[PDB]
Curated annotation (Swiss-Prot), chain A:
Effect of residue 115 to Q: Abolishes ability to deneddylate cullins, without affecting the 'Lys-63'-specific deubiquitination associated with the COP9 signalosome complex
Domain of life, source organism: Eukaryota
BP GO terms, sorted: exosomal secretion; negative regulation of apoptotic process; positive regulation of DNA-binding transcription factor activity; positive regulation of transcription by RNA polymerase II; post-translational protein modification; protein deneddylation; protein neddylation; proteolysis
Location in the cell: Cytoplasm, Cytosol; Nucleus; Cytoplasm, Perinuclear region; Cytoplasmic vesicle, Secretory vesicle, Synaptic vesicle
Subunit structure: Component of the CSN complex, composed of COPS1/GPS1, COPS2, COPS3, COPS4, COPS5, COPS6, COPS7 (COPS7A or COPS7B), COPS8 and COPS9 isoform 1. In the complex, it probably interacts directly with COPS1, COPS2, COPS4, COPS6 and COPS7 (COPS7A or COPS7B) and COPS9 isoform 1. Interacts with COPS9 isoform 2. The CSN complex interacts with the BRISC complex. Also exists as monomeric form. Interacts with TP53, MIF, JUN, UCHL1, NCOA1, HIF1A, CDKN1B, BCL3, GFER, PGR, LHCGR, SMAD4, SMAD7, ID1, ID3, ITGB2 and TOP2A. Part of a complex consisting of RANBP9, Ran, DYRK1B and COPS5. Interacts with IFIT3.
A GO CC term assigned to this protein in UniProt: perinuclear region of cytoplasm
Residue ranges constituting the MPN domain according to the UniProt record: 32-169
GO function term, MF aspect, one: metallopeptidase activity
Natural source organism: Homo sapiens
Family matches, as CDD domains: MPN_RPN11_CSN5
Keyword Nucleus among record annotations: yes
Curated annotation (Swiss-Prot), chain C:
Acetylation keyword on record: yes
Protein name: COP9 signalosome complex subunit 4
Similarity remark: Belongs to the CSN4 family.
Superkingdom of origin: Eukaryota
One function term, GO molecular function aspect: deNEDDylase activity
Role of this protein: Component of the COP9 signalosome complex (CSN), a complex involved in various cellular and developmental processes. The CSN complex is an essential regulator of the ubiquitin (Ubl) conjugation pathway by mediating the deneddylation of the cullin subunits of SCF-type E3 ligase complexes, leading to decrease the Ubl ligase activity of SCF-type complexes such as SCF, CSA or DDB2. Also involved in the deneddylation of non-cullin subunits such as STON2.
Record keywords: Acetylation, Cytoplasm, Cytoplasmic vesicle, Nucleus, Signalosome, Synapse
Assembly and oligomerization: Component of the CSN complex, composed of COPS1/GPS1, COPS2, COPS3, COPS4, COPS5, COPS6, COPS7 (COPS7A or COPS7B), COPS8 and COPS9 isoform 1. In the complex, it probably interacts directly with COPS1, COPS2, COPS3, COPS5, COPS6, COPS7 (COPS7A or COPS7B) and COPS8. Interacts with TOR1A; the interaction is direct and associates TOR1A and SNAPIN with the CSN complex. Interacts with STON2; controls STON2 neddylation levels. Interacts with ERCC6.
Subcellular location(s) per record: Cytoplasm; Nucleus; Cytoplasmic vesicle, Secretory vesicle, Synaptic vesicle
One GO CC term on file: nucleoplasm
Curated annotation (Swiss-Prot), chain E:
Reported function: Essential component of the COP9 signalosome complex (CSN), a complex involved in various cellular and developmental processes. The CSN complex is an essential regulator of the ubiquitin (Ubl) conjugation pathway by mediating the deneddylation of the cullin subunits of SCF-type E3 ligase complexes, leading to decrease the Ubl ligase activity of SCF-type complexes such as SCF, CSA or DDB2. The complex is also involved in phosphorylation of p53/TP53, c-jun/JUN, IkappaBalpha/NFKBIA, ITPK1 and IRF8/ICSBP, possibly via its association with CK2 and PKD kinases.
Gene name as annotated: COPS2
Family of this protein: Belongs to the CSN2 family.
Domain PCI, chain residue ranges per copy: 7-169
Post-translational modification (record): Phosphorylated by CK2 and PKD kinases.
Subcellular location: Cytoplasm; Nucleus
Top-level taxon of the source organism: Eukaryota
Complex formation: Component of the CSN complex, composed of COPS1/GPS1, COPS2, COPS3, COPS4, COPS5, COPS6, COPS7 (COPS7A or COPS7B), COPS8 and COPS9 isoform 1. In the complex, it probably interacts directly with COPS1, COPS4, COPS5, COPS6 and COPS7 (COPS7A or COPS7B). Specifically interacts with the ligand binding domain of the thyroid receptor (TR). Does not require the presence of thyroid hormone for its interaction. Interacts with CUL1 and CUL2. Interacts with IRF8/ICSBP1 and with nuclear receptors NR2F1 and NR0B1. Interacts with NIF3L1.
Listed name of the protein: COP9 signalosome complex subunit 2
Curated annotation (Swiss-Prot), chain G:
Annotated positions of the (Microbial infection) Deamidated glutamine modification: 40
Region ranges (Interaction with UBE1C): 70-72
Annotated site residues (Interaction with UBE1C) in this chain: 8, 44
Function statement: Ubiquitin-like protein which plays an important role in cell cycle control and embryogenesis via its conjugation to a limited number of cellular proteins, such as cullins or p53/TP53. Attachment of NEDD8 to cullins is critical for the recruitment of E2 to the cullin-RING-based E3 ubiquitin-protein ligase complex, thus facilitating polyubiquitination and proteasomal degradation of cyclins and other regulatory proteins. Attachment of NEDD8 to p53/TP53 inhibits p53/TP53 transcriptional activity.
Modified positions (N6-acetyllysine) in chain numbering: 48
GO CC list: cytoplasm; cytosol; extracellular exosome; glutamatergic synapse; nucleoplasm; nucleus; postsynapse
Tissue occurrence: Highly expressed in heart, skeletal muscle, spleen, thymus, prostate, testis, ovary, colon and leukocytes.
Name of the molecule in the record: Ubiquitin-like protein NEDD8
Subunit field text: Interacts with AHR; interaction is direct. Interacts with NUB1; interaction is direct. Interacts with ESR1.
Length: 298, 43, 135, 141, 196, 273, 76, 213
């Protein structure tokens, strides 16, 4: 049944952990499945973080070649993108929360960590890469999840990326798709330097039978918020920041044209196209709303 | 003179965008001719 | 809004001991009632002149202005005072968010009406819903 | 002089500056720069006088700067045209009104002008490409 | 003379020296101590010493204490009434007279700043009525405060009022659009000039 | 009587809790949990919800106050501005066991709420119900019972996007945007057409004449057009012109890029080096 | 004495320690057993981070306990 | 629902009892729509006789206004302060039904109020009765209504209801058709551009291949 995935097999998990097959291979984990509740909690926490960054922990299991995530819990850190982990407050919090959840019925174990990159894409920086490398070196398995709560609102689709790094000294053989991601100027050097040390798993979402029934029952009352959204007002500081970054990139492209990585004008054009398309979508939504509601003069 | 909150100004901006779009389309059309030029295959 | 006659009735019903009044005036109950009246009128007016606020609160216009300014400074209520026109301005209710709220209210009305229809003629609404997909 | 300039006693400050100018002109290394320094000081005083005001009366300004209303009007015009004062004179009631510029209309105007210039330049260079391809040039005979 | 902060630090060090060594001189040193306390307005603990309270409660010398209480409370009427009512204690000492001006101006400035908060356009005669000074004094104080960037507003001289800026618009969007337009202009010029 | 705003995260938490417990124990079993939210005046809003640990002796259920307090400290560590609101359970109509657990919970807060979710339901509407405690005197005896409240689904952009993505789980861009708007407009059309049919059927004569429904239909018809005022029109045109200028600048940038590519190719072709 | 040691991920290590051993001694025991350097290591007992130096028996050896282990990255 | 109780207790009454009950229900606070009482066959039969004035009063309270009452003051029986207040509230609701930003002048003219304070107090009372939700604007002399209850309807009014709902359905259908057409056009444009680019690349590859040989 669909709820079969919700059954936790302690014996099978112990057997898989004790018969680790990921050691012989390196790209062993290729699929990453996320429950509906975990994804929703991650997105709401990243959004409520605001403009700052938030990070939590993820509880799941493994089934052969795929990595399943069932739950996620935040940890305080006072957020504010502190230097790194914690003044030991989060260090106590992780163990305390796991122990408390053990005696209730949350009998799954940690599988990774998630954090937010609000406004500048979904990737692993240098410190993130070092953290994931260290975690995978000792406690295995482990997956990093990066969310973009601002681009999610702006584009209408969730911006979630699951990543896993490579061992020290390992040179992956080509096979780089490298789809384009807009990244500001002040955060481009780190992305360029630390880009071949990790790979992105294919992420899919799942939900239970009761969850599906409840969502299909809830849509009958939730259809209002789609028609009363007005996305052009909630995201204006983000658009202003995007325009500032685009102007700086255009200045750099003009400097390269005057002088004597490659063709920065094309990248600036793609960024401008993305921003303008988002703005026009926001406007046409309001045009549709006006046509629906303001013209039906009794 | 005016504040920019009129359908007339909206139409003016629309006309300017239409002219720019036509300009770019012609640019691309005359660029592809150079692209498929045999002389523009040796270099 | 608590009226002066109701306040007087409550004062008459109250025991003499409970009427704790400051020496300079402005008995505690009357001050609390005036502040409550101002805070409740904040929910009813876009902007109100000093004369009408004084008539509403049954106090002189100068005292009304002073109390409103003190309440605004202390952060209890939101607004700003235009002294030249003698007008206190409460919240603004911008046009586009008002449009969003009214669209939400209209859709809520549609939903409630559909529920009431389906709770009165169940067989008819079942037949209509069944024919809705076919037609 | 410096204290009265700081605490906005412009009439007295300028009067004592004019008193001291005659002795200052006989110096060695400051005689050439006296005129420039005095002009800069007076312009700074004029700009600082109008800083806190949104609608200033020109009679009081003229009285405080030891000049007639007509001379003050001419000086204000010269300052508004180029320098730091952003204001408009009203010579009916003789009042200087601060001018607040709206950003929206200005940006719209400048963007439309830039678009027009860009389109004209693109058309011109398209013609230039055509003539360059066709090899049109002026020969000696 | 009193050369600002250097003279202030010299005064604190001298007063500390005369407190450690000149014990019997406290009878007249306490006035200077409280004056220095209101000049710094940072310690705001002149009554911390419990030994001074029994000698202060004697009614012969209480003008300093009531001045401190009025100054901390930030009310002008009590300060002025005590100053003019109290005699042969305050106005006769040049070392107090030369510094009473800033003392009286600080409370007026603070009261004006607190008063100005809720209003958007407020008359100058109203401020003059509240601060108990003439209209010209109010205008001078407002000009000095506005130039010092302590009061955000501008004076309308013709109508004799002042209007404070409370509305904030989204100018960042238009600044970004201006930057984008300028960069586009420069880039277009360069791209056109490339062909030759 | 307080207005209640619900969040789909709470419903998802409850449903996942019930499904997990059922799968773990082999057979369905009821669960008891706690809610978290914010109260502003008379507006109560729920945001998240964790699970409480309970034991049964004889036929009575007791909540571990020590575990509750440790969880309260833990959640106050993270969500600083959030507070306790009430408890939730899975089942049908309220029972004396529910009244007993509510009496137990009432020793913690003043007026805790009570949420009830029904996993096994046959109706068309959401099985979530919200109750509050009311103490009354019946036949000279003091008993505390339940009063049902009306709740509305709260609005949040990230929540809406996440819920829509989870519900849908599915080659252009305008495509996707317009498809979402289409789904919602379709729901509106269906509903308005069913209402028009009832009204037309009632007018011609097919169903008993109902006055309340017809009056509400008249009130609904009198609500259009929405916000036809001059200030709204000015704001709308402001937004339209702003987006138009942004589109103009984007078009200019794209044309500049195409121009640069053409100039490069022309220089490579028609130059002798 | 011997005390399974469990990390957050779920791995448990069967390790041999003496009651008179100190927290630093257990840390280097874990270093030899697994490989984690004794600075990227935090042991937490009963929801409490031990102040290294403080011996161990004090804290509370009580035989088969389970000291919770969480990694760290020193500075970098 | 007081109207249900009044209907239940009105079965056996007639004549003077009926008129007294009508006066009581009109004066009763809370009830603002009288449709079932007017629908009663006995009440509709009260027309024949000397008590048609009470039926006319009930009709005025169901569908009527204060100017209508003033124009027909002599025929109708005298009303107390509570009934006049209810009629003024219903007049405000009737105005707000068709206008969503009501000026002060029309309200003053309709309700025959003299000073602004009385009118504003009346509007505040109407707001507090939870029968009209809005805000009062003194600077512009406006009352902005966000919500107003639906008043009583006639048998011939339903044509407007069906016409408005038909117009709304037609608008929704037109919007859906436009969305479908726009999606189709965008997809066709994208596929056409991709095909043209692929064809150009293929031609370039063919030219390079035949040139390099
Ligand atoms: C799994 C967690 C607890 N963790 N384990 C280990 C490892 F030592 F075990 C180490 C860690 C761990 O907290 N890492 C970490 C590193 C850096 C940041 C910040 C940091 O750069 C500051 C700028 C913002 C930023 C953008 N991208 C990473 N950051 C964070 C972090 C992210 C969001 C909120 C709070 C903190 C966490
Ligand atoms: Zn990061």
């Amino acid at each position: 049944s669909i709820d079969e995935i919700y059954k936790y097999d302690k014996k099978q998990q112990q057997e898989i952990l004790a018969a680790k097959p990921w050691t012989k291979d390196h790209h062993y984990f290729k699929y990453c499945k996320i429950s509906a509740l975990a994804l929703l909690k991650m997105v709401m926490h990243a959004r409520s973080g605001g403009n700052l960054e938030v990070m939590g922990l993820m509880l799941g299991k493994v089934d052969g070649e795929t990595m399943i995530i069932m739950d996620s819990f935040a940890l305080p850190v006072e957020g504010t993108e502190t230097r790194v982990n914690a003044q030991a407050a989060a260090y106590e919090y992780m163990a305390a929360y796991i122990e408390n959840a053990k005696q209730v019925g949350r009998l799954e174990n940690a599988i990774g960590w998630y954090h937010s990159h609000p406004g500048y894409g979904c990737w692993l920086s240098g410190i993130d890469v070092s953290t994931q490398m260290l975690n995978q070196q000792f406690q295995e398995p482990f997956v990093a999840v990066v969310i973009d709560p601002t681009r999610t609102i702006s584009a209408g689709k969730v911006n979630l990326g699951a990543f896993r790094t490579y061992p020290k000294g390992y040179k992956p053989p080509d096979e780089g798709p490298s789809e384009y991601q807009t990244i500001p100027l002040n955060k481009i050097e780190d992305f360029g330097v630390h880009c071949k040390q990790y790979y992105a798993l294919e992420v899919s979402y799942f939900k239970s039978s009761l969850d599906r029934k409840l969502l299909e029952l809830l849509w009958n009352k939730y259809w209002v918020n789609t028609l009363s959204s007005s996305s052009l007002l909630t995201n204006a500081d983000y658009t202003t920041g995007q325009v500032f970054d685009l102007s700086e990139k255009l200045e750099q492209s003009e400097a390269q044209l005057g002088r004597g990585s490659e063709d920065k004008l094309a990248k600036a054009t793609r960024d401008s196209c993305k921003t303008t398309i988002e703005a026009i979508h926001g406007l046409m939504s309001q045009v549709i709303k006006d046509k629906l509601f303001n013209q039906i003069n009794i | 003179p005016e504040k920019y909150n009129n359908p007339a100004m909206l139409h003016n901006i629309d006309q300017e965008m239409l002219k720019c779009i036509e300009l770019d389309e012609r640019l691309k059309a005359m660029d592809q001719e150079i692209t498929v030029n045999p002389q523009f295959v040796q270099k | 809004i608590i009226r002066g006659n109701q306040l007087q009735e409550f004062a008459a019903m109250l025991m003499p001991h409970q009427k704790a009044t400051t020496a300079d005036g402005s008995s505690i109950l009357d001050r609390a009632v005036i502040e409550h009246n101002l805070l409740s009128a904040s929910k009813l007016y876009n902007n109100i002149t000093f004369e009408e606020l004084g008539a509403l609160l049954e106090i002189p216009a100068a005292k009304a202005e002073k109390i409103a300014s003190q309440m605004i400074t202390e952060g209890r209520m939101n607004g700003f005072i235009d002294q030249i026109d003698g007008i206190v301005h409460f919240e603004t209710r911008e046009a586009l968010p008002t449009w969003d709220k009214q669209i939400q209210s209209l859709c809520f009305q549609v939903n409630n009406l559909l529920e009431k229809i389906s709770q009165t003629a169940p067989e008819w609404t079942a037949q209509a819903m069944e024919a809705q997909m076919a037609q | 002089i410096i204290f009265k300039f700081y605490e906005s006693k412009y009439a007295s400050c300028l009067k004592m500056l004019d008193e001291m100018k005659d002795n200052l002109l006989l110096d060695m290394y400051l005689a050439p720069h006296v005129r420039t320094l005095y002009t800069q000081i007076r312009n700074r005083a004029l700009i600082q006088y109008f800083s806190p005001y949104v609608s200033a009366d020109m009679h009081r300004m003229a009285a405080a700067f030891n000049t007639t209303v007509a001379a003050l009007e001419d000086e204000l015009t010269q300052l508004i045209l180029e320098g730091l004062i952003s204001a408009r004179v009203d010579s009916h009631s003789k009042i200087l009104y601060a001018r607040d510029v709206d950003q929206r209309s200005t940006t719209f105007e400048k963007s439309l002008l830039m678009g027009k210039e860009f389109q004209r330049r693109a058309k011109a260079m398209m013609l230039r490409a055509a003539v360059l391809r066709n090899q049109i040039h002026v020969k000696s005979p | 003379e009193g050369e600002f902060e250097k003279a202030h630090t010299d005064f604190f060090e001298a007063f500390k020296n005369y407190d450690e060594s000149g014990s019997p001189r406290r009878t007249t040193c306490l006035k200077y101590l409280v004056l220095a306390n209101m000049l710094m307005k940072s310690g705001i603990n002149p009554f911390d010493s419990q030994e001074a309270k029994p000698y202060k409660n004697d009614p012969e010398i209480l003008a300093m204490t009531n001045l401190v209480s009025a100054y901390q409370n930030n009310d002008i009427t009590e300060f002025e009434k005590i100053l003019k009512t109290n005699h042969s204690n305050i106005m006769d000492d040049p070392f107090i007279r030369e510094h009473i001006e800033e003392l009286l101006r600080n409370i007026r400035t603070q009261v004006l700043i607190k008063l100005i908060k809720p209003y958007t356009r407020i008359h100058i005669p109203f401020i003059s009525k509240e601060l108990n000074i003439d209209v010209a004094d109010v205008e001078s104080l407002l000009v000095q405060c506005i130039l010092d960037n302590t009061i955000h507003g501008r004076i309308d001289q013709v109508n004799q009022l002042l209007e404070l800026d409370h509305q904030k618009r989204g100018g960042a969007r238009y600044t970004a659009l201006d930057k984008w337009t300028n960069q586009l202009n420069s880039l277009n010029q360069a791209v056109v000039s490339k062909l030759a | 009587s307080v207005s209640v705003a619900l969040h789909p995260l709470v419903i998802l938490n409850i449903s996942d809790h019930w499904i997990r417990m059922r799968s773990q124990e082999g057979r369905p079993v009821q669960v008891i949990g706690a809610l978290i939210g914010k109260q502003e005046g008379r507006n109560i809003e729920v945001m998240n919800s964790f699970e409480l640990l309970s034991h049964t002796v004889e036929e009575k259920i007791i909540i571990d106050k020590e575990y509750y307090y440790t969880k309260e400290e833990q959640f106050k560590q993270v969500f600083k501005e959030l507070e306790f609101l009430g408890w939730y359970t899975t089942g049908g109509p309220p029972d004396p066991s529910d009244i007993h657990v509510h009496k137990q919970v009432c020793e913690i807060i003043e007026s805790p709420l009570f949420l009830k979710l029904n996993p096994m339901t046959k109706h068309t509407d959401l099985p979530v119900s919200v109750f509050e405690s009311v103490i009354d005197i019946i036949n000279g005896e003091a008993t505390m019972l339940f009063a049902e409240l009306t709740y509305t689904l709260a609005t949040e952009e990230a929540e809406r996007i996440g819920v829509d993505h989870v519900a849908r789980m599915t080659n252009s861009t305008v495509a996707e945007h317009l498809i979402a708007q289409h789904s919602a407009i379709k729901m509106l059309h269906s509903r308005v057409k069913l209402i028009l049919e009832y009204v037309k059927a009632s007018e011609a004569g097919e169903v008993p004449f109902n006055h309340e429904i017809l009056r509400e239909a008249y009130a609904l018809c009198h609500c259009l057009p929405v916000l036809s005022t001059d200030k709204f029109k000015t704001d709308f045109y402001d937004q339209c012109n702003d987006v138009g200028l942004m589109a103009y600048l984007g078009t200019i940038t794209k044309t500049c890029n195409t121009m640069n590519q053409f100039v490069n190719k022309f220089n490579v072709l028609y130059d002798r080096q | 004495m011997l005390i399974k040691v469990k990390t957050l991920t779920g791995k448990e290590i069967e390790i041999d320690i003496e009651p008179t051993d100190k927290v630093e001694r257990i840390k280097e025991r874990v270093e030899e057993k697994e490989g984690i350097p004794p600075q990227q290591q935090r042991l937490i007992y009963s929801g409490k981070q031990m102040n290294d130096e403080k011996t161990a028996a004090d804290y509370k050896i009580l035989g088969g306990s389970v000291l919770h282990l969480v990694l760290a990255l020193r500075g970098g | 629902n007081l109207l249900e109780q009044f209907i239940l207790l009105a079965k056996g009454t007639s004549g003077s009892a009926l008129t007294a009950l009508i006066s009581q229900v009109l004066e009763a606070p809370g009830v603002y729509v009288f449709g079932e009482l007017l629908e009663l066959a006995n009440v509709q039969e009260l027309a024949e006789g000397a008590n048609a004035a009470y039926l006319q009063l009930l009709n005025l309270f169901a569908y009527g206004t204060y100017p209508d009452y003033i124009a027909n003051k002599e025929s109708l029986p005298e009303l107390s302060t509570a009934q006049q207040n209810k009629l003024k509230h219903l007049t405000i609701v009737s105005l707000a039904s068709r206008m969503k930003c009501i000026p002060y002048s029309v309200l003053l003219k309709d309700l025959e109020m003299r000073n602004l304070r009385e009118l504003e107090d009346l509007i505040i009372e109407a707001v507090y009765t939870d029968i009209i939700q809005g805000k009062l604007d003194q600077r512009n002399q406006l009352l902005e209504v966000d919500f107003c209850i639906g008043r009583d309807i006639r048998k011939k009014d339903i044509n407007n209801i069906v016409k408005t709902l038909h117009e709304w359905c037609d608008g929704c259908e037109a919007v859906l058709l436009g969305i479908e057409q726009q999606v189709l056009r965008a997809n066709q444009y994208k596929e056409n551009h991709n095909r043209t680019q692929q064809q150009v690349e293929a031609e370039v590859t063919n030219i390079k291949k035949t040139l390099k040989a």
